[PDB]
Design a protein around this ligand. Structure first.
Ligand SMILES: *[C@@H]1O[C@H](CO)[C@@H](O[C@@H]2O[C@H](CO)[C@@H](O)[C@H](O)[C@H]2NC(C)=O)[C@H](O)[C@H]1NC(C)=O
Ligand SMILES: CCCCCCCCS[C@@H]1O[C@@H](CO)[C@@H](O)[C@@H](O)[C@H]1O
Ligand SMILES: CCCCCCCCS[C@@H]1O[C@H](CO)[C@@H](O)[C@H](O)[C@H]1O
Ligand SMILES: CCCCCCCCS[C@@H]1O[C@H](CO)[C@@H](O)[C@H](O)[C@H]1O
Ligand SMILES: *[C@@H]1O[C@H](CO)[C@@H](O)[C@@H](O)[C@H]1NC(C)=O
Lengths: 8, 389
């Protein structure tokens, strides 16, 4: 969630 | 697909180089001139009075390359003031050759993350529903009011709050790419960035996530207390668990928000640089993951020691189910999570895609696995459900 948000 | 954050990075570099041109270009031949200016969309040079001034549409636009023949223009008026409408109170510009900027699709996230989005969204939807049903079942029956059932009820509330916070995150990020927030020369999205609502939702997500992992840790420690001690443990330990699973994630999540204003406040606490600040939240979460895994393996050793003589067909069933939970969480989850301390500092690629795939699908469906495991599949809940039906 927190990591995935970045590239998103 | 050029992402929002990458567009901001390029724009900032545009601004640096742009200000450098503003400083270094020589002054005009005569003082009859309107002043060069950066209006945050383009660097305008000085203009001859009564002439058109051209600059390429600024190259930081994700789609600037599709209209390279287009230019944006200003008029330096004959009075040596930039042309402005008595109305708009702001200087006139023509952006029309670059107007597809308002409605184009080039500013989109990488499609692979959209591939993961449907998966983890479905997993938190079914997990949210089944956890609502199971939490209603354990909460509703006075004959089922176990202490351990209250612990599992707290774990259900943690998974449910996690799915809700992830839903609000998906609504915010979905709005960030929406046509409304991505206005022509978008400004409403920047006004949303200044809002407390932009950052508070993501901090709330961080609390729901860290509280979920710490509640899984409370689940593992509680299993080890029930098995290694073989005791009917009391309320002081329960008061401790209530302080832990909601308390500790607050204890390391609050500093992440404090630093998140003190630095990277312009990031809306979504994208994050300075990897140590992201270790401020994930590192305790890695601690809860590894400790819960080690207590899991130790419980496996206890069951290996204590059931050594007995084998029944039910042991063939439930023991194989323990092989399922081990191969799902013990064999895989801790591998990706413990290596993840190195896997985000480097080693990106398709390996990063498989990592996000396994972790997202896992923690997304783990709430449904916990709902079916601690409630619907429990034998006493089945006989008690058949008692009335
Ligand atoms: C500045 O940019 C525009 C082209 O984008 C040029 O302005 C055109 O000039 C004619 C007169 O020669 C105007 O009647 C047109 O309205 C303009 N075009 C458009 C599409 O508006 C202008 O020549 C450029 N200036 C310089 C110095 O190159
Ligand atoms: C038409 C006859 C149908 C009768 C159904 C009886 C249920 C079998 S109990 C079986 O084993 C238990 C071990 O714990 C649990 O796992 C249960 O969920 C289940 O899997
Ligand atoms: C009719 C024409 C349809 C064209 C479809 C294009 C598919 C793009 S693949 C995708 O593009 C990303 C770029 O950002 C990469 O990061 C990924 O690794 C890669 O898998
Ligand atoms: C192994 C497949 C090779 C051919 C193309 C399909 C796979 C795309 S990899 C993809 O590229 C992104 C950046 O380009 C990274 O952000 C991602 O983490 C990574 O997963
Ligand atoms: C704009 O014009 C004024 C004259 O009043 C001059 O002093 C400069 O400030 C000029 N702008 C820049 C960047 O030099």
């Amino acid at each position: 969630x927190g990591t995935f948000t970045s590239d998103x | 697909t050029v992402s929002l954050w990458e567009t901001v990075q390029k724009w900032r570099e545009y601004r640096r180089q742009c200000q450098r041109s503003l400083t270094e270009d020589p002054p005009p031949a005569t003082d009859l001139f309107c002043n060069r200016t950066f209006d945050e969309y383009a660097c305008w040079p000085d203009g001859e009075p009564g002439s058109f001034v051209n600059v390429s549409c600024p190259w930081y636009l994700p789609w600037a390359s599709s209209v390279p023949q287009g230019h944006v223009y200003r008029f330096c008026t004959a009075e040596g003031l930039w042309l402005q409408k008595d109305n708009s109170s702001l200087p006139w510009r023509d952006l029309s050759e670059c107007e597809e900027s308002k409605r184009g699709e080039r500013s989109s996230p990488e499609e692979q993350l959209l591939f993961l989005y449907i998966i983890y969204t479905v997993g938190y939807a079914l997990s949210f529903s089944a956890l609502v049903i199971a939490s209603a079942i354990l909460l509703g029956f006075r004959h089922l009011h176990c202490t351990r059932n209250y612990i599992h009820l707290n774990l259900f509330a943690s998974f449910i709050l996690r799915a809700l916070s992830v839903f609000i995150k998906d609504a915010a990020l979905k709005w960030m790419y929406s046509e409304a927030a991505q206005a022509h020369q978008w400004r409403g999205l920047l006004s949303y960035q200044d809002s407390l609502s932009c950052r508070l939702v993501f901090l709330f997500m961080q609390y729901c996530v860290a509280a979920n992992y710490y509640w899984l840790l409370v689940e593992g420690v509680y299993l080890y207390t029930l098995l290694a001690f073989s005791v009917f443990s009391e309320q002081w330990i329960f008061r401790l668990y209530v302080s832990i699973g909601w308390g500790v994630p607050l204890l390391f999540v609050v500093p992440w928000g404090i630093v998140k204003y003190l630095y990277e406040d312009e990031a809306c606490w979504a994208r994050n640089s300075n990897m140590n600040y992201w270790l401020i939240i994930r590192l305790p979460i890695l601690f809860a993951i590894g400790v819960n895994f080690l207590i899991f393996v130790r419980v496996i050793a206890i069951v290996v020691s204590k059931l050594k003589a007995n084998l029944m067909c039910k042991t063939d069933i439930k023991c194989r189910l323990a092989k399922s939970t081990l191969t799902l969480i013990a064999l895989l989850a801790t591998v990706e999570v413990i290596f993840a301390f190195v896997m985000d500092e480097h080693a990106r690629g398709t390996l990063r895609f498989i990592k996000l795939f396994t972790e997202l699908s896992f923690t997304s469906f783990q709430g449904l696995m916990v709902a079916i495991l601690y409630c619907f599949a429990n034998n006493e809940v089945q006989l008690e459900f058949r008692k009335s039906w």
